[PDB]
Structures are given as C-alpha cells and as structure tokens.
RNA sequence: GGUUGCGGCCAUAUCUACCAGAAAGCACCGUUUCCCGUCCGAUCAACUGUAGUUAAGCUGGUAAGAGCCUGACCGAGUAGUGUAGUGGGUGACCAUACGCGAAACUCAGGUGCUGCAAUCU
RNA sequence: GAGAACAGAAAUCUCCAGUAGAACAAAAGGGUAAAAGCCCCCUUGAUUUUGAUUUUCAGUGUGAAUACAAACCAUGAAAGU
RNA sequence: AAGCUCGUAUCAGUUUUAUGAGGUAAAGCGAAUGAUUAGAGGUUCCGGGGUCGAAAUGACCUUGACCUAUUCUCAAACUUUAAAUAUGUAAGAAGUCCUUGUUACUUAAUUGAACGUGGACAUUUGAAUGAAGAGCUUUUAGUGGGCCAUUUUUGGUAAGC
C-alpha cells in the first residue's frame, strides 16, 4: 500500500558472484557451536 | 578543552535481517515503522547465495535510521532490555556502538500474532558539533584529530549518563 | 590478420602525461585563435571528439577556419614525391599557439627599433643575424692559477 | 591517526593533486568550463557571469568575466549594503536577494549606459518576463546564471537574485519553474505567490501566526523586529520603497575605511608567525640531539 | 634430449620471459640461490670473492644448478658446511624456444628451458667467509668455472662481505655508531629522517 | 598584512603529528509556518542572526618527518649513440678517431605564487 | 580496518580509511572522480537537406570518423550539450 | 620526347638560429604493474598443528599467512626519468606600423571579425651554403620475379635459409 523505499548501492559490480572474502577456506574449524 | 565539543548521538539505525522477502519481510517492516513512526527503507541482496536461500536484489532486509530526541527514547528503550550492560567490543574505535536484541516486543510494543516476533540490530552513531564539515557539499573537509570521536571518549560517555556498565575486558 | 585502425600504435602517444590526467585547465579554452595563426598540433586523449589523427601529432600548421569549438588547420602532408594540402578540424584542446614565430616578431619589433634608433642617429646598422664566430685572441693569467699537471690513472678493480 | 591506514612513500609520490579550488571544494570546474568558454568565432568577446554566492547571512552578487591572468569583476553588490536602502533585517532571505539582484542589475546597467533605456520592470506584479530587446537600439546586456554549487530546487533563493536581476533590466536567460509558486503537477506559475516572496510575504505571514500562537519563539527570532517596532504587515512596504531607493541611487558607496592600508597590515603581522632560518633549525637539531642524547 | 649447450649460447633474441603471453614454460633447474650459512651476521664474513663473467652470453639454469652444486659441495666439505655464504647473483628469467620435430612452415617455438642473460663484468657467484678461508673459496669458484660456457674469472672483492662499502669504510661506519645489525644484512644510520625514531634505532650513536 | 567571493597556473600548494591564531570575514551553530528534498530537516530547502562557539573547518608555524620542487665539474663526459678504418679478437666481442650525451646515485636549497572586486585594528 | 540479535568464510546495518587499485556490452590499449562510473528524472538528434573535411588512398571507391551550414526537436535554472 | 611562361627568379636528400613533437636505446625496481632470492622485526577474538587444560573473546610453544623496514635478481607485448639518429613549423614586400571604410556575421555597444581606401617605414629584405637558373604542360616506352654489402632487426639449432 505505501511506496516501498529501497537503498541505493553505490558499488559498481554487475556480476552475481560472491566477493573474494567469501571463501570456504577461511572457516575456523571447531567453531563454538551449540549443544545440549 | 571542551566548550562546544560535548558529544551527541548522530543517529540510531535499527536493522532486521531476514532470509527472504514476501510476507515475513513486510511484517518486519511494519515492526520498524510503528517503532520509529517513520516509513522505513528495505535493502536488496547484493548477490545470490542459496545456502541462505537468497538471490541478488531479492529485498532481503529492512532498516530505518533515526535522529534527534526520538532516537534517545528508542535507544534507552532498548538499553533497558540489555539491562544497561554492553561489552568492550560493541564499541568501534571510531567511537560508535551497537547491540542486538531478539524479540522486538521486549521494549514497549504489544504482540499481534498476525505480525510475529523479530529481532533487531540497534546501532548508534556518535559525532560532535562540527559534524557537517565532512557532510555538507561546499568546502567538504575532515574533522581535525582532537575533535574526532574515539572509543575511549565514547565508553566513558556511555559509562556516565545511562549509568550503565561496559563490562568484559 | 594485420591491423590498422584509426588510432593504431597510439598507445603511448595519446597517453595522458604522468600526474597530469583529468579535466583540462581553463586557459586552454581561453586562448583566442584568429585565422592565420601558427598552431602546434598535439592530441589530448581525454578529448575524443575533434581529435587529430596520429599522423599530425607533433605537426605545426596554420588555421584557416574558426568555428564554435574548433580551428580548422591546413597542413602540408608529404605523400609520394609531392606535398598535398590537407585540412584538419581540431578542437582547441588539441591546439596551442606556436612559439616558433615568437622570436621572429620580437626581432621584427626589435629590427624596426634599431633601424629608427640608428637611422635617427646617422645609420651604420648591420641588423642581420650571424652564426657563432670563432673565438678572439685572449691572454690568460697564471697569477694565482699555476697550471696543475695531470696524468692518466692506473687500472683498478673495486668490485 | 590510525597506524595501519598509512600513506606509503609511493602513495605520496604518485598522488595527483586535484587543482586547488577543487581541493577546497569551492569550484566545480566542469561547470566553470561550460560557463566560461566563449564561442571561438566570437574571439575576445567576454562571457559575463552572474555570480550569486550565499555566505552565512551575507549575499554576494557579482558580474564577472574571465581572463587567463584572473577573473575580473565588472560590478559587485552585497546584501550588507542594503541598510543604505532601508533593510536592516533578514539580509539572508529571498527578498534580500531579489533586492541585491536588482541592486546589481541597475548598478552595472548604470555605469554601462543602458541605464536610462532598459529600466526593466518597475511595476513588480511578479509575472514571468525576460527584459526584451529595444527596437532600433543597443541590445540588453547579457549575463548568465552562475549557481556555484547551489542545488537546483524549485523555490531556492539563488533564483531570487535572478528575478531581481531579470526584473532589474539585465538579460539573464531563465525559465519559470525554479521559482516559488511553481506548480509541480501542471506547468503553471502563480505570480501572486512569487510576488509575495519578493517583498517577504512568507516571512511576515510567519510573524503573523507567531504573535498569536507562540510568542516565545517570536521573542527569540524576530527580536530586532520588536526592538525596531516593525511588525508584520509593514514588511512589504520596507522592500517596496527600497526598490525605489535602489533604482534612485545604485552608485555604490564604499565605507570610510578607518585605518588605511599600512595600518591594517602593521597590526596583522603581530599575529602572523615568521618561519625560521636553516642555521636556527640546524641549531634546533644540534640541540635536540644534545638533549635527547642523554 | 637436452639440446647441446651451443644452440642457446649467445643472446640472439630479445628477452622471452615467462609471462601471460607465455605461461607454458617448465620449471627452472636451479632453484635455491643461497647456501652455506645464510643467517650469518654481516660482521662474521668480511672477505668477499666473486665469479665474474667476462662474456656477454647466456647461462642455462641446468648449468647454474651444476656449478652451484659444485662450488658449494667443495667449499662445504673443505672449509665446512657453515664456513661460507654462497649466493648466486644471476637468475634464469629467459625462456628458450625450440622447434619440435609440417616444414619450416609455422616454426615458432615452444618453451624448451630457461637461462639467464649474463653481461661482461657481471658477477655470477658471490661468496663471503673469513679471510682465513680465501683459498678454499677461490678454488671452489675455480671448480665451478668448468661448468660454464665462456670466459669467467674469479675476483677478490674490495668490499666488506656482501656490503656496498669498502673494508676501511665499513669499520669507520661500524666503529662509530652508524651500523646496526639486521638478519643477514645491516641497516645504516642516515642523517635524514625524523629525529624522533632515528634515535629510537641506533641508540648506540649520539655519544661521540 | 588578515579575510571573503571569482579565480590563473595546478603538490614549493599534497600528506602525517603537534601547537599558535587579535580584528573582521568565514565557519559551526538556532528553528520548521512557508517553497522545496529525504527511511531520517544529517544532506538538500526555507526562516532567524536571534540563543551559544573558536571545538572543528580555515589561516599560519614546528619537523636531522613522508612526498613534491630546484640546483651542482655529485655520479658521469659513465651508459647509450651519429660517423670511420683492408683497426684487435676464432668468436663472443673490444679498444681507437670525430661528434652527441642519459637515467639512477650523492650533495645543497626550497615548502605555493599571484589576479579582479568587497572587506578588516 | 573497527564495529551490531539469530548470522557462520559469505546475508543485512554503521563508521573510518580509500588516485581509482573499480566500473564503462565485448578483444586489447587509451580515456574518465562533484565523471565518462552508480541511482533517478525528462526525452528520441539513432531525425530532415545537401556540401566540405580526416583515415585507408589512385589522394577512386567502401566502411568508419571530424568540424560547420540550414531546418525541426530533446534536456536542463542557465551557460550548454 | 615536345616544348611553354619567364628570368633575379623562385630554388635545395645541407648547415646555423628560434620553437614544437616522439617513448626506442640506456636507465629503474629499498617508484606503480608483473616477476624474483634471502634473511630480520612486528600482528590474530580469527589457517592449521601441539602442551597445560571443564572451558575461555585462555596462557605458552609452533607452522603458515599477512604487515613494516630491508636484501639478490628480471620484462617485445612494464615504468617515473630519458638520450643519440632521424622529424613538424618559423628566419619578412604575400613584411611591419599609423589612419579609418564596407556587412545581411558578431558584440551591451560602430563592439569585433573578415577585405578594404589612404599614410609612414628601404635597403645589408631579414642566418649559412650552394644554384645555372626557375616555374608549367602534355603525351608515351620499358617495368611492375630482384639480389648483395655494413648497421638495425623477426622466425629458426643453424643455412650460401
Ligand atoms: Mg548498484
Ligand atoms: Mg562501498
Ligand atoms: Mg597486428
Ligand atoms: Mg608523452
Ligand atoms: Mg562519437
Ligand atoms: Mg554540476
Ligand atoms: Mg649430438
Ligand atoms: Mg632469432
Ligand atoms: Mg670455462
Ligand atoms: Mg571572530
Ligand atoms: Mg539542523
Ligand atoms: Mg541549507
Ligand atoms: Mg585550538
Ligand atoms: Mg595546517
Ligand atoms: Mg624533506
Ligand atoms: Mg679471421
Ligand atoms: Mg666518444
Ligand atoms: Mg633535502
Ligand atoms: Mg609545506
Ligand atoms: Mg587506465
Ligand atoms: Mg553530472
Ligand atoms: Mg542528436
Ligand atoms: Mg571516405
Ligand atoms: Mg573497418
Ligand atoms: Mg618502454
Ligand atoms: Mg613501442
Ligand atoms: Mg632494454
Ligand atoms: Mg630509471
Ligand atoms: Mg617492482
Ligand atoms: Mg623529474
Ligand atoms: Mg622578405
Ligand atoms: Mg596599402
Ligand atoms: Mg628470384
Ligand atoms: Mg647466394
Ligand atoms: Mg638467397
């Protein structure tokens, strides 16, 4: 009903691809985890 | 010296991240409108993930920024649910701070099962007088060092009013 | 397949001059070109319209036309065993007044002076130009400077 | 500041400074190109710019031409002179610009001889008009709208100093839709509203609601209005007759200047530090190593 | 299968380095260029000796590698595995092309191996020890002489260790406060730079 | 001399850290009825110059600062190069004759200059 | 880089740094920072008349391009484009 | 080949002077980009290992990354700097200066632009050197497989390729 408002992304990247910081290799193993 | 430099909250920005769009997103917007009275701004997913069940530009999450006294109500209204204790992190060496809370009901705000429960990301921006010097158009410039907001200057300032406790290490 | 496009080989020619990129200082647009001026032609890569062809870089010419943004220049290009007259339309970003003529006029003005200044003095002018003339006789003094004698040096390694 | 944010020797070395007036955020050069550049086949004919600058509460209106040695001021009018013509209050407002634009329009038109001819609009019903060309006569002096960095917003008061210069006899090309009263959802103007802003009809009608609604504010802002005994409905007269007084005597009184050149300088150098000598710096170094040795 | 060394001896073609217009090249045959005691402090090994190339020619990786091994192995087992620091001053950056076994039609090569373009008076092998050791160093270069094409002559360095300074100029720099150890090398006291942390480092100066 | 508006060249002007800055001018700063712009009067707009402040911006100074600029028989007449020989060398190459002449290095000096207008103890 | 519930190496929010290390369909190389990049608004000049010009060059053609003239338009406060 | 218009004239595979262009050689890498050897010094709430451990946003060893000052060595398709040889234009009568006409272009403007009437300025007409000359037109033959030498340089192990 109201006009939705969407944020303007100054970044110039058209590619639907994850950035380099996003990689399987960082991934601390045995991270805290829930239990119980 | 400190005549004009005291401190002020520049803005508060509430945030709701949600793994989709559709109903669940709009409700979370309804949450932030009546919480700010302002009508809020959604964001779009910057790329596709699919382990989060999201695609690029899928309208993932809403937020709203608040300035003025009407923030300090919603800040303190929030600092209540966190029981006036934050951490030594939560504070950015730039001088800001933020904290999250599950259950938006926990501050004012009746239930309405046709809305549901959402969490928020409360983040607070601290600047000073002379904070337009890096904001305005003409002669855009950069706050001198001695005037910049720091973590030390912000924590002590959070310690005193609000009375609250910084804790941790 | 071989290649020649209009801008071929111009990589380093049209390149923007280190720490000098970006928009163009306004004195360029300020200068006024009257027909018949002597122009130097140097491209400015930032200005893609009204751009001289790579041949005419470094060339000097004279302006036959004056339009809105651009002075039309004629250049005599050599092709084969003759020169043909060629006509270039250049924006003044790419042009600069040539200082070749600078000394000339200054000498012209200088010459008319020395003329009326010597003539109103009873002539004896000699206003043409001379090549460097062999040195004159001179004495040189040994007082306080005795000749310091020199010897070639023996070979050394030092590495 | 932050030790890991660091300008490397390379950074400095290969940094390319923007110009100067670009670093100071003062000049948008891409607008200065498109303004200043003369059609090359008009040769030395200067392009003249209408320079409307807003400080904090002083209005700077200049007609300036351009030269590779430096830009050159033909005529200069400020709002701080407006006390001469009967305005001591609200020198930063839409009506004070219109007033400072009619002062610049008729100050140049005066020393330019276009004075007696081309009187612009002396009526001011706030209609849209550019000063027309007189049949068999000189053409209206042309000057163009240098906004500075000001944002183009319908109603903004840079266009006040415009409408005071275009109703004041100069030929400054413009359209209607940056003017208060511009209708958004149909192309139209209401002159009535625009007229009002020329004499301050928003600032009075603000004073009007603030006497009977909140006088606390009305006692804080609008202080000098009481201190001078000037209430709301009289604002239009103050400006109406200042227009008259302006066309009367545009001639520019400078101030009586009170301490000449040599004086102002002799006092200003007491506060301005004078650098050093290498031998002294050299002695500083030989001294600091002496001290910082032990 | 390795083409005899006479085909690539001379610098006949512009440098053909491995690059993105290349990519296909095999590994270099010499890999490690620093041997002996490479952690040695600048003051440990004052004496320096050079193998200098007197020709303008090309030296194959496999030839570097084999005069590396030679000169090291002898120098170690004669004066002992830490007696010296042997650093190879030359790197094989040039890809050599071969035309495999068309006709001569379409003859552009494919990377056959690597080598290093060497100058006249260019140092190839540099070694530092105690002056006590010179004849062991010298012979150890001398025995790597045989593994290389061309005229290469050994040279006694006017300088201190691997440094840029002659022996006297090193003492005067070291016996005043100007010299400060780094791991295999040194850093030096400059008369330029911020006086604050200029005195932080080299605190041993500033007395005289 | 200081300052502001418009500037010319566009680092001797930029950068980092301090400190000093009278007068004016800038600046921050006060409000939200009006035109206007926003998720948000932060920016943009409008009103006030009042209520408050030199805190920042800005100006300048400090610095064996970074960088930039300039200079030198500093390196170096080196590298490279135009011209020549029935010059040396198996060759790679290299000396000589007649001219041209770098870059890096090092030393020393420097840290914006100024136009048009209005200002200001 | 430092920061904030679920939130992880990557989701959305905020600051500080940031000469371009990005982006401009595509090949490469130029070029570009209050833009030539990113967002939005309005438009259709990607039009009409026929010459001159540069590249290839025989100074033919063709493709591509450059500056004008005359119209009729777009956009913008305007200079302009 | 035919001539033709002329004749102190314009003229040049050359120099000097003045002023422009260029990015090769060399140079550079404790300058960008890309490569590349070795140490040293920092930094992890955080790559992975161990020891202490209920654990920790725990302490300590440790290995990898980054960071900061360094060090050896490189580039046809890298670069701040940047040659030599070659390269554009200028060195006057078609010139310089005064005065003030024409217009439908252009300026706020009889402003400016373009072409002008009229007037003044002389010889050593504007550096060197050379010149028997210079400019101009028509027509038409053969030819349209080249090869070699020094230097520059591509492919190739090379080749009398
Ligand atoms: Mg985007
Ligand atoms: Mg970003
Ligand atoms: Mg090709
Ligand atoms: Mg260049
Ligand atoms: Mg185009
Ligand atoms: Mg603009
Ligand atoms: Mg065999
Ligand atoms: Mg070859
Ligand atoms: Mg041998
Ligand atoms: Mg003051
Ligand atoms: Mg405010
Ligand atoms: Mg505003
Ligand atoms: Mg202070
Ligand atoms: Mg300062
Ligand atoms: Mg310095
Ligand atoms: Mg022989
Ligand atoms: Mg020589
Ligand atoms: Mg110095
Ligand atoms: Mg400085
Ligand atoms: Mg680029
Ligand atoms: Mg724009
Ligand atoms: Mg169009
Ligand atoms: Mg064509
Ligand atoms: Mg084509
Ligand atoms: Mg190059
Ligand atoms: Mg090239
Ligand atoms: Mg080279
Ligand atoms: Mg270099
Ligand atoms: Mg490098
Ligand atoms: Mg330089
Ligand atoms: Mg002549
Ligand atoms: Mg005449
Ligand atoms: Mg044949
Ligand atoms: Mg043969
Ligand atoms: Mg043959």
UniProtKB/Swiss-Prot annotation, chain A:
Coiled coil region boundaries: none
Top-level division of the source organism's lineage: Eukaryota
Subcellular localization, as worded in the UniProt entry: Cytoplasm; Nucleus; Cytoplasm, Perinuclear region
Post-translational changes noted in the entry: Phosphorylation by TORC1 upon nutrient replenishment inhibits STM1 and causes its release from dormant ribosomes.
Covalent cross-link Glycyl lysine isopeptide (Lys-Gly) (interchain with G-Cter in ubiquitin) as placed by the record, residue numbers: 26
Residues recorded as bearing Phosphoserine in the entry: 12, 21, 25, 35
Subunit and interaction comment: Associates with mature 80S ribosomes. Binds to the head domain of the 40S ribosomal subunit and prevents mRNA binding by inserting its alpha-helix domain towards the mRNA entry tunnel at the decoding site, where it blocks the binding of tRNA and mRNA at the A- and P-sites. Interacts with EFT1; interaction sequesters EFT1 at the A-site of the ribosome, thereby blocking the interaction sites of the mRNA-tRNA complex, promoting ribosome stabilization and hibernation. Interacts with CDC13. Associates with the telomere-proximal Y' element.
Family: Belongs to the SERBP1-HABP4 family.
Miscellaneous: Present with 46842 molecules/cell in log phase SD medium.
Protein name in the entry: Suppressor protein STM1
Protein source organism: Saccharomyces cerevisiae (strain ATCC 204508 / S288c) (Baker's yeast)
Classification lineage: Eukaryota, Fungi, Dikarya, Ascomycota, Saccharomycotina
Curated annotation (Swiss-Prot), chain B:
Modified how: N-terminally acetylated by acetyltransferase NatA.
Pfam families, sorted: Ribosomal_L5 (PF00281), Ribosomal_L5_C (PF00673)
GO biological process, one term: ribosomal large subunit assembly
InterPro entries: Ribosomal_uL5, Ribosomal_uL5_C, Ribosomal_uL5_CS, Ribosomal_uL5_dom_sf, Ribosomal_uL5_N
The keyword NADP is annotated on this UniProt entry: no
Sites bearing N6,N6,N6-trimethyllysine, chain numbering: 70
GO cellular component labels: cytosol; cytosolic large ribosomal subunit; nucleus
Nucleotide-binding in keyword set: no
Coiled-coil regions listed: none
Extent of the signal sequence: none
GO molecular function: RNA binding; rRNA binding; structural constituent of ribosome
Keywords for this protein: Acetylation, Cytoplasm, Methylation, Nucleus, Ribonucleoprotein, Ribosomal protein, RNA-binding, rRNA-binding
Major site of localization recorded for this protein: cytoplasm
Membrane-spanning segments: none
Superkingdom per UniProt: Eukaryota
Subcellular location: Cytoplasm; Nucleus
SUBUNIT field: Component of the large ribosomal subunit (LSU). Mature yeast ribosomes consist of a small (40S) and a large (60S) subunit. The 40S small subunit contains 1 molecule of ribosomal RNA (18S rRNA) and 33 different proteins (encoded by 57 genes). The large 60S subunit contains 3 rRNA molecules (25S, 5.8S and 5S rRNA) and 46 different proteins (encoded by 81 genes). Component of a hexameric 5S RNP precursor complex, composed of 5S RNA, RRS1, RPF2, RPL5, RPL11A/RPL11B and SYO1; this complex acts as a precursor for ribosome assembly.
Miscellaneous: Present with 39000 molecules/cell in log phase SD medium.
Annotated family: Belongs to the universal ribosomal protein uL5 family.
Record protein name field: Large ribosomal subunit protein uL5A
Source organism per UniProt: Saccharomyces cerevisiae (strain ATCC 204508 / S288c)
Curated annotation (Swiss-Prot), chain D:
Subcellular location: Cytoplasm; Nucleus
Main localization, broad class: cytoplasm
One cellular component (GO) term of this entry: cytosol
GO biological process: cytoplasmic translation; ribosomal large subunit assembly
Record field: transmembrane: none
Keywords: Cytoplasm, Isopeptide bond, Nucleus, Phosphoprotein, Ribonucleoprotein, Ribosomal protein, RNA-binding, rRNA-binding, Ubl conjugation
Any matching Pfam family: Ribosomal_L18_c
Matching InterPro entries: Rbsml_uL18_euk, Ribosomal_uL18_C_euk
An example Gene Ontology molecular-function term: 5S rRNA binding
Location in chain, cross-link Glycyl lysine isopeptide (Lys-Gly) (interchain with G-Cter in ubiquitin): 163
Modified residues annotated as Phosphoserine in this record: 166, 175, 234
Entries under SUPFAM superfamilies matching the protein: Translational machinery components (SSF53137)
Family, similarity comment: Belongs to the universal ribosomal protein uL18 family.
Subunit description: Component of the large ribosomal subunit (LSU). Mature yeast ribosomes consist of a small (40S) and a large (60S) subunit. The 40S small subunit contains 1 molecule of ribosomal RNA (18S rRNA) and 33 different proteins (encoded by 57 genes). The large 60S subunit contains 3 rRNA molecules (25S, 5.8S and 5S rRNA) and 46 different proteins (encoded by 81 genes). Component of a hexameric 5S RNP precursor complex, composed of 5S RNA, RRS1, RPF2, RPL5, RPL11A/RPL11B and SYO1; this complex acts as a precursor for ribosome assembly.
PANTHER family, per database record: LARGE RIBOSOMAL SUBUNIT PROTEIN UL18, RIBOSOMAL PROTEIN L5-RELATED
HAMAP family reported for this sequence: Ribosomal_uL18_A (MF_01337_A)
Protein name: Large ribosomal subunit protein uL18
Taxonomic path: Eukaryota, Fungi, Dikarya, Ascomycota, Saccharomycotina
Curated annotation (Swiss-Prot), chain E:
UniProt function note: Component of the ribosome, a large ribonucleoprotein complex responsible for the synthesis of proteins in the cell. The small ribosomal subunit (SSU) binds messenger RNAs (mRNAs) and translates the encoded message by selecting cognate aminoacyl-transfer RNA (tRNA) molecules. The large subunit (LSU) contains the ribosomal catalytic site termed the peptidyl transferase center (PTC), which catalyzes the formation of peptide bonds, thereby polymerizing the amino acids delivered by tRNAs into a polypeptide chain.
Region (2 X 15-17 AA approximate repeats): 156-205
Top-level taxon of the source organism: Eukaryota
GO-annotated molecular function: structural constituent of ribosome
Positions of Sequence repeats: 156-170, 189-205
Record-linked CDD domains: Ribosomal_L16_L10e (cd01433)
One example of a Gene Ontology biological process annotation: translational termination
Residues found modified as Phosphoserine: 132, 194
GO cellular component, one term: cytosolic large ribosomal subunit
Listed name of the protein: Large ribosomal subunit protein uL16
Family: Belongs to the universal ribosomal protein uL16 family.
Organism (species): Saccharomyces cerevisiae (strain ATCC 204508 / S288c)
């Amino acid at each position: 009903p109201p006009k939705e408002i969407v944020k303007s992304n100054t970044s110039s990247k058209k590619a639907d691809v994850p950035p380099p910081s996003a990689d399987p290799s960082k991934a601390r193993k045995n991270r805290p985890r829930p239990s119980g | 010296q400190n005549p004009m430099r005291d401190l002020k909250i520049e803005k508060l920005v509430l945030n709701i991240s949600v793994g989709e769009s559709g109903d669940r997103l709009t409700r979370a917007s309804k949450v932030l409108e009546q919480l700010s009275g302002q009508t809020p701004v959604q964001s779009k997913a910057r790329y596709t993930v699919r382990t989060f069940g999201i695609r690029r530009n899928e309208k993932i999450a809403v937020h709203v920024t608040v300035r003025g006294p009407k923030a300090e109500e919603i800040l303190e209204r929030g600092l209540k649910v966190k029981e006036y204790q934050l951490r030594d992190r939560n504070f950015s060496a730039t001088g800001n701070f933020g904290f999250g809370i599950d259950e938006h009901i926990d501050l004012g705000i009746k239930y309405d099962p046709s809305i549901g429960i959402f969490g928020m990301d409360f983040y607070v921006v601290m600047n000073r007088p002379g904070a337009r010097v890096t904001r305005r158009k003409r002669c855009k410039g950069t706050v001198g060092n001695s005037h910049k907001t720091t973590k030390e200057d912000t924590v002590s300032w959070f310690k005193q009013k609000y009375d609250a406790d910084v804790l941790d290490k | 397949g071989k290649s020649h496009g209009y801008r071929s080989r111009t990589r380093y020619m049209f390149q923007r001059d280190f720490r000098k990129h970006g928009a163009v200082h306004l004195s360029t647009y300020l200068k006024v070109y009257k027909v018949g001026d002597i122009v130097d032609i140097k491209a400015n890569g930032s200005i893609q319209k009204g751009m001289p062809h790579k041949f005419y870089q470094g060339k000097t010419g004279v302006v036959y036309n004056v339009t809105k943004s651009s002075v039309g220049v004629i250049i005599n290009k050599m092709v084969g065993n003759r020169y043909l007259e060629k006509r270039l339309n250049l924006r003044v970003e790419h042009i600069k007044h040539s200082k070749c003529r600078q000394e000339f006029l200054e000498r012209v003005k200088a010459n008319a002076a020395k003329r009326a200044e010597a003539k109103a003095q009873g002539v004896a002018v000699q206003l043409k130009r001379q090549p460097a003339q062999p040195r004159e006789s001179r004495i040189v003094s040994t007082e306080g400077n005795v000749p310091q004698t020199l010897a070639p040096v023996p070979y050394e390694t030092f590495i | 500041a932050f030790q890991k944010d660091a300008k490397s020797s390379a950074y400095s070395s290969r940094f390319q400074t923007p110009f100067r007036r670009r670093r100071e955020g003062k000049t948008d050069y891409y607008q200065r190109k498109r303004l200043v550049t003369q059609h090359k086949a008009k040769y030395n004919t200067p392009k003249y710019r209408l320079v409307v600058r807003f400080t904090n509460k002083d209005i700077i209106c200049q007609i300036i031409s351009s030269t590779i040695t430096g830009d050159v001021v033909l005529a200069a009018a400020y709002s701080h002179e407006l006390p001469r013509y009967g305005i001591t209050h609200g020198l930063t407002n839409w009506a004070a610009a219109y007033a400072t634009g009619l002062l610049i329009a008729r100050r140049t038109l005066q020393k330019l001889g276009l004075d007696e001819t081309y009187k612009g609009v002396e009526e001011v019903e706030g209609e849209y008009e550019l000063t027309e060309a007189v049949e068999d006569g000189p053409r209206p002096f042309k000057v163009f709208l240098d906004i500075g960095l000001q944002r183009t917003t319908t109603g903004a008061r840079v266009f006040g100093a415009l409408k005071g210069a275009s109703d004041g006899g100069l030929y400054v090309p413009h359209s209607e839709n940056r003017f208060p009263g511009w209708d958004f959802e149909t192309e139209e103007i209401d002159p009535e509203l625009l007229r009002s802003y020329i004499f301050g009809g928003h600032v009075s009608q603000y004073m009007e609601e603030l006497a009977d609604d909140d006088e606390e504010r009305f006692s804080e802002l609008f202080k000098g209005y009481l201190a001078d005994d000037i209430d709301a409905d009289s604002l239009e007269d103050i400006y109406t007759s200042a227009h008259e007084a302006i066309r009367a005597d545009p001639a520019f009184k400078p101030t009586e200047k009170k301490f000449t050149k040599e004086q102002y300088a002799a006092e200003s150098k007491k506060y301005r530090q004078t650098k050093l000598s290498k031998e002294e710096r050299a002695a500083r170094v030989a001294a600091k190593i002496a001290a910082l040795a032990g | 299968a390795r083409r005899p060394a006479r085909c690539y001896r001379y610098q006949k073609n512009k440098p053909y380095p491995k690059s993105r217009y290349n990519r296909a090249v095999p590994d270099s045959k010499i890999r490690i260029y620093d041997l002996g005691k490479k952690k040695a402090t600048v003051d440990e090994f004052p004496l320096c000796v050079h193998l200098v190339s007197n020709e303008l020619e090309q030296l194959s990786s496999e030839a570097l590698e084999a005069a590396r091994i030679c000169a090291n192995k002898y120098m170690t087992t004669v004066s002992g595995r830490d007696a010296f620091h042997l650093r190879v001053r030359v790197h094989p950056f040039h890809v050599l092309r071969i035309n495999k076994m068309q006709g001569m039609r379409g003859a552009w090569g494919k990377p056959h191996g690597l080598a290093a373009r060497v100058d006249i008076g260019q140092i190839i092998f540099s070694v530092r020890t105690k002056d006590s050791n010179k004849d062991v160093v010298v012979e150890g270069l001398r025995r790597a002489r045989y593994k290389f094409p061309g005229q290469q002559k050994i040279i006694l360095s006017k300088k201190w260790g691997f440094t840029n300074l002659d022996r006297p100029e090193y003492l005067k720099k070291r016996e005043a406060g100007e010299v400060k150890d780094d791991g295999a090398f040194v850093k030096f006291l400059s008369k330029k730079g911020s006086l604050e942390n200029n005195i932080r480092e080299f605190p041993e100066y500033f007395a005289a």
